[model samples]
Target: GDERFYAEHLMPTLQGLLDPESAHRLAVRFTSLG
Candidate 1:
C-alpha cells in the first residue's frame, strides 16, 4: 500500500543476494542503531 511497506517487502530479495557474512554484518549494524 505504501513505499515503506514495499521497500520492506523488497528487502529479503536484496538480502538473498548477500553472502551469510555480509548479512550478519548488516544485521549487527542495524541492531546497533536501536
Candidate 2:
C-alpha cells in the first residue's frame, strides 16, 4: 500500500485545524520561509 496515495484524504484534517473560511484561504496561500 502506498502511504502517499491518500494525502488528499489526510490533508482535510490539517485544513480543519483552522477556521473554515480561514483554512480555505490559508490552504490557498503559501508564503515561503516560515
Candidate 3:
C-alpha cells in the first residue's frame, strides 16, 4: 500500500524526467497490461 502510494505520487515526476517518446511507450505498455 505504501509502495503504491509513493508510486502514484511519483509517476508524474518520473515521466517528466523521461523522454516524451519513451514515456509514451511506457504509458502504452502500462495501459496494455491493465
Candidate 4:
C-alpha cells in the first residue's frame, strides 16, 4: 500500500476527529514501526 494513498484516503476520513499534525505524527510513527 502506498503511504500517500493511505494519507489521502484515510486522513480526510479522519479529519475533525484528528488534528493534521497529530495525524501526521501518528502516521510517521506507524511507518517507522513498520
Query: TM-score of each candidate?
Result: 0.32, 0.25, 0.34, 0.35
Score candidate 1 by TM-score against the native: 0.32
Instruction: Note each model's CA RMSD in angstroms.
Output: 6.1, 6.8, 6.7, 8.9
Tens-digit lDDT string for candidate 1 (1-34):
5676567656654654364776777777888877
In order of TM-score, best first, we have: 4, 3, 1, 2
Q: Sorted by lDDT, highest first, which candidate order results?
A: 4, 3, 1, 2
Off by over 4 Å in 4: 1-18
How many Å off is the CA of 32 in candidate 3?
Answer: 0.9
lDDT of 1: 0.65
TM-score of predicted model 2?
A: 0.25
Residue-by-residue lDDT tens digits, candidate 4, 1-34: 5787688767765672366777677777888995
lDDT of 4 at 30: 84
State residue 17's C-alpha deviation in candidate 3, in Å: 3.8
lDDT at 6 for candidate 4?
Answer: 81
Clashing pairs in 1: none
- How well does candidate 4 match the true structure in TM-score terms? 0.35
| lDDT by residue (tens digit), candidate 3, 1-34 | 5677577656755654475876777777888986
**Leading candidate by lDDT:** 4
